[PDB]
Amino acid sequence: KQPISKLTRATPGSAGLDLCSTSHTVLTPEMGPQALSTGIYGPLPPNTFGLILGRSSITMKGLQVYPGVIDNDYTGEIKIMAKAVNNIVTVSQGNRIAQLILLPLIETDNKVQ
Amino acid sequence: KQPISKLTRATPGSAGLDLCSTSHTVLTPEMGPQALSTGIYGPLPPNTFGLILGRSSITMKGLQVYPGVIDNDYTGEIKIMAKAVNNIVTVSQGNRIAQLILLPLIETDNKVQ
Amino acid sequence: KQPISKLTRATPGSAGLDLCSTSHTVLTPEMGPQALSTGIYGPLPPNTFGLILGRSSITMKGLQVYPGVIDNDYTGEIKIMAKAVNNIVTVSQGNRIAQLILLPLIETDNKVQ
Ligand SMILES: O=c1ccn([C@H]2C[C@H](O)[C@@H](COP(=O)(O)NP(=O)(O)OP(=O)(O)O)O2)c(=O)[nH]1
Ligand SMILES: O=c1ccn([C@H]2C[C@H](O)[C@@H](COP(=O)(O)NP(=O)(O)OP(=O)(O)O)O2)c(=O)[nH]1
Ligand SMILES: O=c1ccn([C@H]2C[C@H](O)[C@@H](COP(=O)(O)NP(=O)(O)OP(=O)(O)O)O2)c(=O)[nH]1
Ligand SMILES: [Mg+2]
Ligand SMILES: [Mg+2]
Ligand SMILES: [Mg+2]
Numbered sequence: 001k002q003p004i005s006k007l008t009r010a011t012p013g014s015a016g017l018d019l020c021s022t023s024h025t026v027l028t029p030e031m032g033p034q035a036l037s038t039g040i041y042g043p044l045p046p047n048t049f050g051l052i053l054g055r056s057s058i059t060m061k062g063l064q065v066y067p068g069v070i071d072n073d074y075t076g077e078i079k080i081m082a083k084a085v086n087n088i089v090t091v092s093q094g095n096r097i098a099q100l101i102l103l104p105l106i107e108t109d110n111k112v113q
Numbered sequence: 114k115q116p117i118s119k120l121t122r123a124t125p126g127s128a129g130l131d132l133c134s135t136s137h138t139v140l141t142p143e144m145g146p147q148a149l150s151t152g153i154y155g156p157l158p159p160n161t162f163g164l165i166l167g168r169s170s171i172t173m174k175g176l177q178v179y180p181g182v183i184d185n186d187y188t189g190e191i192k193i194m195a196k197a198v199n200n201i202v203t204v205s206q207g208n209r210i211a212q213l214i215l216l217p218l219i220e221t222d223n224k225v226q
Numbered sequence: 227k228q229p230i231s232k233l234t235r236a237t238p239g240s241a242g243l244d245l246c247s248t249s250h251t252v253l254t255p256e257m258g259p260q261a262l263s264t265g266i267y268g269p270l271p272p273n274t275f276g277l278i279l280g281r282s283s284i285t286m287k288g289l290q291v292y293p294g295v296i297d298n299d300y301t302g303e304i305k306i307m308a309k310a311v312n313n314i315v316t317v318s319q320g321n322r323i324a325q326l327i328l329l330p331l332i333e334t335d336n337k338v339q
Contacts, residue, residue, distance in 0.1 A: 004336075005334075005335070005336065007336055008336060008337045008338065008339040009336055009337075009338050009339070010297075010338075010339065011297065011299060011338060012299070012338050013269075013297050013298040013299030013300075013331075014297045014299075014338075015275035015295050015296075015297050015298065015331055016295050016297075017334075017336055029199075030199065032175055032198050032199040032200070033172055033173050033175065033198065035173060043126075045334065048332060049128035049214075051166075053277075053293055053294075053295055054292060054293075056294050056295075056305075056307060059259055059292045059294070059307050060259050060261060060307060062258055062259065064292065066167060066172045066177065067166055067167075067180055067293055068166075068169050068172070069128050069129050069166055069169075069212065069214060070128075071123075071124065071126050071127045071128050071129075072126040072128065073124060073125070073126030073127075074126075079169075081169060081172050081173060083198065085258050085259065085309065086255075086256065086258040087258070099295065101275075101295060102332045102334065103216060103329060103330070103332070104216070104217060104330060104332070105126075105128055106161060106215045106216070106217070108118075108130075108158065108215065109118070110117075110118065110120055110121060110122055110130055111121045111122075112121065112122050112123075112124060112125050112127075113121040113122070113123065142312075143312065145288055145311050145312040145313070146285055146286050146288065146311065148286060156239075162241035162327075164279075179280060179285045179290065180279055180280075180293055181279075181282050181285070182241050182242050182279055182282075182325065182327060183241075184236075184237065184239050184240045184241050184242075185239040185241065186237060186238070186239030186240075187239075192282075194282060194285050194286060196311065216329060217329070217330060218239075218241055219274060219328045219329070219330070221231075221243075221271065221328065222231070223230075223231065223233055223234060223235055223243055224234045224235075225234065225235050225236075225237060225238050225240075226234040226235070226236065
């Protein structure tokens with residue numbers, strides 16, 4: 001169970017923190033959306049939330065990552081929601097397949113149900 | 114016609130403001146993108162804009178929400194752009210199917226056409 | 227080779243900077259993801275990064291843009307990653323098909339591999 005602080009960025013000016021799949025997974029379009037496990041857990045730094053997006057090279061190879069929100073106070077495992085677009089996609093254990101981007105969490109007076 | 118201030122968040126640290134469909138709608142993949150009505154209208158708080166994203170549990174059930182930008186000065190009805198991925202999807206009136214996330218609107222000198 | 231400063235926004239309160247395709251391109255669903263060229267190059271203003279999203283009217287006409295991250299220090303050509311959803315899509319040279327949104331780049335202590 002690793003916290004977000006263990007993630008790395010490709011370059012100093014890279015916006016995304018790369019996420020790996022902890023399992024070897026084969027995906028086909030007929031399977032629809034699948035939740036890939038990353039081994040990384042919330043919560044996030046104060047006053048931030050996360051967006052999970054695909055890496056461009058992975059998108060171009062036919063694996064679509066559906067953008068996901070990581071809440072500031074989420075303490076579960078970060079999953080990547082993904083679907084093979086056209087072809088059979090093979091995700092090997094350790095392949096970096098998505099990235100976490102951190103964004104400011106704006107306060108509002110909206111009610112909390 | 115309800116303003117964004119009427120939306121609610123799941124938990125204090127939830128980044129998204131949940132959006133419902135005001136109509137019962139059936140969707141199939143052959144239909145392609147459909148615009149679902151929410152009953153909620155812009156504009157947004159000063160110096161912010163909005164992103165519309167799917168809820169993860171709804172994405173995993175096979176309804177893809179295409180991410181959308183809500184401009185600061187949009188005064189129309191917020192719609193959710195959605196497509197059934199693989200299967201028939203039935204959206205009941207009142208189902209929360211997407212979420213609005215508020216983000217800072219950065220000023221630049223880019224021209225305004 | 228044009229910098230981001232040359233882009234325009236639809237209205238003063240429009241969050242997105244519109245991106246055009248510099249080539250006439252036909253797309254079908256069987257083709258999967260294709261990278262469209264825009265003629266516009268990073269890098270981005272200090273302390274910002276970019277998200278590339280579809281325009282809503284273009285999404286509703288059946289061209290899906292996969293959201294992409296533009297890093298602060300990217301100096302290559304901004305491309306739009308796109309797929310025809312259901313039908314044949316014809317992108318004419320000069321059609322505005324996506325938009326760049328600028329967001330704050332949050333600093334963290336994550337390591338840089
Ligand atoms: O891609 C994702 C999206 C969400 N998540 C986790 C973290 C986020 O805080 C949590 C809930 O996200 P959403 O609000 O998008 N899902 P939903 O509205 O279905 O669940 P909840 O009712 O708990 O808010 O799911 C992921 O791990 N990966
Ligand atoms: O998912 C969405 C996306 C956009 N919208 C509305 C609000 C946003 O301010 C407005 C215009 O969004 P885009 O700029 O993405 N669309 P487009 O560029 O086609 O229209 P315009 O030329 O008016 O900017 O459409 C939604 O209601 N839901
Ligand atoms: O839609 C996109 C996404 C990315 N890009 C460019 C700019 C961005 O800085 C760069 C790298 O993006 P990602 O980190 O998403 N791709 P990946 O992780 O495959 O490459 P790298 O290993 O270089 O980080 O690709 C685009 O031009 N359009
Ligand atoms: Mg990268
Ligand atoms: Mg939620
Ligand atoms: Mg627009």
